[PDB]
Amino acid sequence: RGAFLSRHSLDMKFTYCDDRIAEVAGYSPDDLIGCSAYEYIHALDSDAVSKSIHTLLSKGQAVTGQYRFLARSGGYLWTQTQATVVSGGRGPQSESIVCVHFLIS
Ligand SMILES: CCCCCC/C=C\CCCCCCCCCC(=O)OC[C@@H](O)CO
C-alpha cells in the first residue's frame, strides 16, 4: 500500500524513509535518518549508483540499475530506485532528492 519512498539531501543522507523499512530490512526509519545512503550500497554497486546520481543531478531524474542495499542484519537486498531532484525554493544549494524504491528480490 503506497509506493516505498525516501528523501535525501544532496549528500544522500536520509531525511525521510518509509516506515516499511522495518518489514523489509530490519531498520526503523529513525535508524537511517542522517546517514548517507552511500554507506548502505554494496561496494560492488557503488560506482554504478554514483553514475546514476550524476545523471540525476544533470538531468533531474534517473533510474538505477539493480543494486544491493545493506540490511540491518548484514545481508543485502536487491533493490532498484527511481529518483528526482526537488527544488528547495532558495536556489541550487537548496535542492533535495526524492526516491521511489522497488524490491527486486
Ligand atoms: C538515482 C538515485 C539513487 C539512490 C539510491 C540509494 C538510496 C537509498 C537506498 C535504498 C533505501 C530503500 C531500501 C529498501 C527498499 C524497499 C522497496 C520495497 O519494499 O518495494 C516494494 C515494491 O517492490 C512493491 O512490492
Numbering used by the authors: 238 to 342
Recite the paper's sentences:
HIF, closely linked to disorders of the circulatory system and cancer progression, consists of two multidomain subunits including the constitutively expressed HIF-1β and an oxygen-labile HIF-1α (or paralogs HIF-2α and -3α). HIF-3α9, the longest (669 aa) and canonical isoform3, is a potent oxygen-labile transcription factor, tightly regulating the expression of a unique set of genes. Due to the use of different transcription initiation sites and a combination of splicing events in HIF3A, the C-terminal Per-Arnt-Sim sensor domain (PASb) is the only common architectural feature among the HIF-3α isoforms. The PASb domains in both HIF-α and -β subunits have a crucial role in forming active HIF heterodimers and recruiting co-regulators.
Hereby, we present the crystal structure of the recombinant human HIF-3α PASb, or PASb-3α, at 1.15 Å maximum resolution. Although with a backbone virtually identical to that of the PASb domains of both HIF-1α9 and HIF-2α10, PASb-3α has a unique extensive C-shaped hydrophobic cavity of 510 Å3. We identified a 1-(11Z-octadecenoyl)-sn-glycerol molecule of bacterial nature buried in this cavity, as clearly suggested by the size and geometrical features of the electron density map. As such, the aliphatic tail of the fatty acid extended to eighteen carbons in length (maximum length limited by the cavity size), with a cis double bond between C11 and C12, interspersed by four gauche configurations (at positions C5, C7, C9 and C13,). The ester group at the glycerol sn-1 position makes polar contact with the main chain carboxyl group of His339 and main chain amino group of Leu340. The sn-2 position is not substituted, also sharing a hydrogen bond with the Leu340 main chain amino group. Based solely on the electron density map, we could not tell whether the glycerol sn-3 position was substituted, due to absence of well-structured atoms beyond its remaining hydroxyl group. However, the presence of a well-coordinate sulfate ion (abundant in the crystallization solution), 6 Å apart from the glycerol sn-3 hydroxyl, suggested that PASb-3α could also bind to phospholipids. Collectively, all complex lipids identified as PASb-3α ligands include the 18-carbon unsaturated 11Z-octadecenoic acid (or cis-vaccenic acid; 18:1, cis-11) and an unmodified sn-2 glycerol position as common structural denominators. For the first time, we document that a eukaryotic PAS domain may have lipids as high-affinity cofactors, thus introducing a new class of PAS ligands and expanding its already vast functional portfolio.
